[PDB]
Protein backbone atom coordinates (compact mmCIF):
# COMPACT_ATOMS: atom_id res chain seq x y z
CA UNK A 1 0.00 0.00 0.00
CA UNK A 2 1.75 3.21 -1.23
CA UNK A 3 1.62 5.94 1.49
CA UNK A 4 -0.38 9.05 0.39
CA UNK A 5 0.76 10.96 3.51
CA UNK A 6 -1.51 12.03 6.43
CA UNK A 7 -5.28 12.23 5.67
CA UNK A 8 -6.96 15.62 6.37
CA UNK A 9 -7.66 16.09 10.13
CA UNK A 10 -10.52 18.61 9.59
CA UNK A 11 -13.44 17.70 11.93
CA UNK A 12 -16.15 18.63 9.37
CA UNK A 13 -16.24 18.77 5.52
CA UNK A 14 -17.00 22.18 3.89
CA UNK A 15 -20.79 22.62 3.31
CA UNK A 16 -21.92 21.85 -0.31
CA UNK A 17 -25.03 23.45 -1.93
CA UNK A 18 -26.75 22.08 -5.09
CA UNK A 19 -29.07 24.49 -6.98
CA UNK A 20 -30.66 22.88 -10.08
CA UNK A 21 -31.96 26.17 -11.60
CA UNK A 22 -28.53 27.91 -11.27
CA UNK A 23 -26.75 24.93 -12.93
CA UNK A 24 -29.52 24.41 -15.57
CA UNK A 25 -27.56 26.05 -18.45
CA UNK A 26 -26.88 23.82 -21.51
CA UNK A 27 -24.48 24.49 -24.45
CA UNK A 28 -23.92 21.01 -26.03
CA UNK A 29 -21.22 20.46 -28.71
CA UNK A 30 -21.73 17.61 -31.26
CA UNK A 31 -18.62 15.47 -32.01
CA UNK A 32 -17.20 16.49 -35.41
CA UNK A 33 -15.37 13.48 -36.99
CA UNK A 34 -14.39 15.76 -39.95
CA UNK A 35 -12.78 18.09 -37.32
CA UNK A 36 -10.98 15.04 -35.80
CA UNK A 37 -12.80 15.64 -32.46
CA UNK A 38 -12.45 12.74 -29.96
CA UNK A 39 -10.03 10.88 -32.29
CA UNK A 40 -7.26 8.85 -30.55
CA UNK A 41 -4.22 7.99 -32.74
CA UNK A 42 -3.54 4.19 -32.89
CA UNK A 43 -0.72 3.22 -30.44
CA UNK A 44 0.61 0.38 -32.66
CA UNK A 45 1.66 2.30 -35.82
CA UNK A 46 1.56 5.61 -37.77
CA UNK A 47 0.21 6.15 -41.33
CA UNK A 48 1.55 9.02 -43.50
CA UNK A 49 -0.12 10.77 -46.52
CA UNK A 50 -2.73 7.94 -46.98
CA UNK A 51 -6.51 7.49 -46.47
CA UNK A 52 -7.67 4.12 -44.96
CA UNK A 53 -10.50 2.80 -42.70
CA UNK A 54 -9.35 1.97 -39.12
CA UNK A 55 -11.37 0.18 -36.37
CA UNK A 56 -10.97 1.79 -32.91
CA UNK A 57 -12.97 3.04 -29.88
CA UNK A 58 -14.41 6.34 -31.24
CA UNK A 59 -17.23 8.78 -30.21
CA UNK A 60 -20.45 8.91 -32.34
CA UNK A 61 -20.57 11.71 -34.98
CA UNK A 62 -23.02 14.49 -34.00
CA UNK A 63 -23.07 13.26 -30.37
CA UNK A 64 -23.66 16.14 -27.89
CA UNK A 65 -22.52 13.76 -25.10
CA UNK A 66 -22.73 14.45 -21.34
CA UNK A 67 -21.75 18.03 -20.34
CA UNK A 68 -20.43 18.77 -16.81
CA UNK A 69 -19.43 22.35 -15.81
CA UNK A 70 -17.58 23.53 -12.64
CA UNK A 71 -18.74 26.77 -10.91
CA UNK A 72 -17.27 29.00 -8.15
CA UNK A 73 -18.55 28.27 -4.60
CA UNK A 74 -20.80 30.82 -2.83
CA UNK A 75 -18.64 33.65 -1.38
CA UNK A 76 -19.36 36.95 0.45
CA UNK A 77 -16.97 39.88 -0.17
CA UNK A 78 -13.33 38.66 -0.05
CA UNK A 79 -14.16 35.53 2.04
CA UNK A 80 -15.20 32.21 0.30
CA UNK B 1 -11.60 15.62 -74.67
CA UNK B 2 -13.45 16.26 -71.35
CA UNK B 3 -15.12 14.40 -68.41
CA UNK B 4 -18.44 14.69 -70.34
CA UNK B 5 -16.98 12.99 -73.49
CA UNK B 6 -17.85 9.24 -73.29
CA UNK B 7 -15.04 8.08 -75.66
CA UNK B 8 -12.31 9.88 -73.63
CA UNK B 9 -13.74 8.34 -70.42
CA UNK B 10 -13.61 4.84 -72.04
CA UNK B 11 -9.84 5.36 -72.72
CA UNK B 12 -9.34 6.31 -69.02
CA UNK B 13 -11.43 3.27 -67.91
CA UNK B 14 -9.21 0.87 -69.93
CA UNK B 15 -6.07 2.30 -68.21
CA UNK B 16 -7.90 2.03 -64.83
CA UNK B 17 -8.81 -1.66 -65.47
CA UNK B 18 -5.11 -2.53 -66.05
CA UNK B 19 -4.21 -0.53 -62.90
CA UNK B 20 -6.86 -2.38 -60.81
CA UNK B 21 -5.40 -5.80 -61.76
CA UNK B 22 -1.88 -4.71 -60.65
CA UNK B 23 -3.26 -3.25 -57.37
CA UNK B 24 -5.05 -6.53 -56.48
CA UNK B 25 -1.80 -8.57 -56.36
CA UNK B 26 -0.16 -6.20 -53.81
CA UNK B 27 -3.32 -5.96 -51.62
CA UNK B 28 -3.80 -9.78 -51.47
CA UNK B 29 -0.23 -10.29 -50.08
CA UNK B 30 -1.22 -8.05 -47.11
CA UNK B 31 -4.45 -10.02 -46.43
CA UNK B 32 -3.92 -12.39 -43.43
CA UNK B 33 -6.27 -15.11 -44.86
CA UNK B 34 -6.72 -16.14 -41.18
CA UNK B 35 -2.93 -16.35 -40.60
CA UNK B 36 -1.50 -14.64 -37.45
CA UNK B 37 0.78 -12.33 -39.54
CA UNK B 38 0.84 -11.14 -43.20
CA UNK B 39 4.63 -11.80 -43.38
CA UNK B 40 5.61 -15.53 -43.24
CA UNK B 41 8.98 -14.51 -41.70
CA UNK B 42 7.15 -12.62 -38.91
CA UNK B 43 5.06 -15.82 -38.34
CA UNK B 44 8.32 -17.83 -37.94
CA UNK B 45 9.51 -15.47 -35.15
CA UNK B 46 6.01 -15.23 -33.54
CA UNK B 47 5.13 -18.98 -33.42
CA UNK B 48 6.86 -22.40 -33.04
CA UNK C 1 -14.30 -0.77 -13.81
CA UNK C 2 -18.06 -0.88 -14.59
CA UNK C 3 -19.15 2.52 -13.16
CA UNK C 4 -17.69 6.08 -13.14
CA UNK C 5 -18.97 9.15 -11.22
CA UNK C 6 -17.72 12.68 -12.10
CA UNK C 7 -16.35 14.44 -8.98
CA UNK C 8 -17.86 17.97 -8.83
CA UNK C 9 -15.13 20.59 -8.21
CA UNK C 10 -16.12 23.84 -6.43
CA UNK C 11 -13.59 26.71 -6.75
CA UNK C 12 -13.37 28.92 -3.63
CA UNK C 13 -13.05 32.19 -5.62
CA UNK C 14 -13.88 35.43 -3.70
CA UNK C 15 -17.16 37.11 -4.82
CA UNK C 16 -15.15 39.74 -6.80
CA UNK C 17 -12.76 37.07 -8.23
CA UNK C 18 -15.57 34.68 -9.34
CA UNK C 19 -14.72 33.64 -12.94
CA UNK C 20 -16.52 31.64 -15.67
CA UNK C 21 -15.07 28.08 -16.00
CA UNK C 22 -14.99 26.17 -19.33
CA UNK C 23 -17.52 23.28 -19.47
CA UNK C 24 -16.04 19.79 -20.09
CA UNK C 25 -17.92 17.38 -22.40
CA UNK C 26 -17.68 13.59 -21.80
CA UNK C 27 -18.30 11.38 -24.89
CA UNK C 28 -18.59 7.56 -24.52
CA UNK C 29 -16.18 5.37 -26.57
CA UNK C 30 -17.57 2.45 -28.65
CA UNK C 31 -15.77 0.34 -31.33
CA UNK C 32 -16.39 2.13 -34.68
CA UNK C 33 -14.98 1.96 -38.24
CA UNK C 34 -13.58 5.43 -39.07
CA UNK C 35 -12.30 6.46 -42.52
CA UNK C 36 -9.08 8.35 -41.62
CA UNK C 37 -7.22 11.09 -43.57
CA UNK C 38 -3.46 11.25 -42.79
CA UNK C 39 -1.31 14.31 -43.72
CA UNK C 40 2.46 14.31 -44.52
CA UNK C 41 2.96 14.77 -40.72
CA UNK C 42 0.68 11.70 -40.34
CA UNK C 43 -1.63 13.44 -37.81
CA UNK C 44 -5.42 13.13 -38.45
CA UNK C 45 -7.27 16.40 -39.30
CA UNK C 46 -10.31 14.88 -41.13
CA UNK C 47 -12.33 11.63 -40.74
CA UNK C 48 -15.82 10.11 -41.47
CA UNK D 1 17.72 -19.96 -16.90
CA UNK D 2 14.79 -17.95 -18.40
CA UNK D 3 15.70 -14.43 -17.11
CA UNK D 4 18.86 -12.38 -17.98
CA UNK D 5 18.02 -8.85 -16.68
CA UNK D 6 21.64 -7.54 -16.38
CA UNK D 7 23.81 -7.63 -19.57
CA UNK D 8 27.35 -6.29 -20.43
CA UNK D 9 27.93 -2.75 -21.82
CA UNK D 10 27.46 -2.48 -24.61
CA UNK D 11 25.42 -5.59 -25.61
CA UNK D 12 24.44 -4.06 -29.01
CA UNK D 13 26.97 -4.18 -31.91
CA UNK D 14 27.53 -2.19 -35.16
CA UNK D 15 26.19 -5.05 -37.38
CA UNK D 16 22.82 -4.94 -35.49
CA UNK D 17 22.63 -1.15 -36.18
CA UNK D 18 20.79 -0.29 -39.46
CA UNK D 19 23.43 2.35 -40.43
CA UNK D 20 26.10 -0.38 -40.99
CA UNK D 21 23.74 -2.33 -43.35
CA UNK D 22 22.23 0.80 -45.05
CA UNK D 23 21.63 0.35 -48.82
CA UNK D 24 21.84 -3.48 -48.56
CA UNK D 25 19.03 -6.10 -48.79
CA UNK D 26 19.01 -7.32 -45.13
CA UNK D 27 16.76 -9.35 -42.78
CA UNK D 28 15.28 -7.03 -40.10
CA UNK D 29 14.08 -8.16 -36.63
CA UNK D 30 13.24 -4.89 -34.81
CA UNK D 31 10.69 -4.65 -31.93
CA UNK D 32 8.91 -7.94 -32.81
CA UNK D 33 8.72 -7.37 -36.61
CA UNK D 34 10.60 -9.88 -38.85
CA UNK D 35 10.95 -9.25 -42.63
CA UNK D 36 13.45 -8.91 -45.53
CA UNK D 37 13.99 -5.25 -46.56
CA UNK D 38 16.47 -2.60 -47.84
CA UNK D 39 16.88 0.54 -45.66
CA UNK D 40 17.52 3.88 -47.46
CA UNK D 41 18.22 7.16 -45.56
CA UNK D 42 15.44 9.71 -46.35
CA UNK D 43 13.58 12.75 -44.87
CA UNK D 44 11.55 11.72 -41.77
CA UNK D 45 7.77 11.20 -42.41
CA UNK D 46 4.90 10.03 -40.14
CA UNK D 47 4.71 10.27 -36.30
CA UNK D 48 8.18 9.81 -34.68
Contact A48, C24 (CB under 8 A): no
- Calculate the CA dihedral of residues B9, B10, B14, B19 and round it to 10 degrees: 20
| Resolution at which this structure was determined, Å | 2.5
- The CA-CA-CA angle for residues C8, C28, C21, to 5°, reads 35
Q: Which residues of A touch C27 (CB under 8 A)?
A: 31, 38, 59-60, 63, 65-66
Q: Can you say whether residue B20 is alpha, beta or left, with left for phi > 0 and alpha for psi between -120 and 50 degrees?
A: alpha
C21/C11 Cα distance (integer angstroms): 9
Neighbouring CB atoms inside 10 A of D13's CB total 8
- Calculate the CA dihedral of residues C30, C31, C34, C39 and round it to 10 degrees: 90
Best to test chain A binding among D42, D44, D45, D47 (most A CBs inside 10 Å): D47
Q: What is the bridge-based pairing of β-strands A66-68 and C24-26?
A: antiparallel
**CB-based contacts of A25, cutoff 8 Å, min separation 6:** A69
B41 touches chain D (CB under 8 A): yes
Helices (H), B1-48: 6-30, 40-46
| SS3 (DSSP) at B18 | helix
Are D46 and A47 an interchain contact pair (Cβ–Cβ within 8 Å)? yes
Q: Which residues of A touch D45 (CB under 8 A)?
A: 48-49
Amino acid sequence: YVDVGPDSVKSACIEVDIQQTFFDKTWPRPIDVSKADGIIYPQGRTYSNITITYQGLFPYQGDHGDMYVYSAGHATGTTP
Amino acid sequence: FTTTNEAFQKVQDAVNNNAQALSKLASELSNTFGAISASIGDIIQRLD
Amino acid sequence: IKYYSIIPHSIRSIQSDRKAWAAFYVYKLQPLTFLLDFSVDGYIRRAI
Amino acid sequence: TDTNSVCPKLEFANDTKIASQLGNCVEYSLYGVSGRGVFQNCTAVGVR
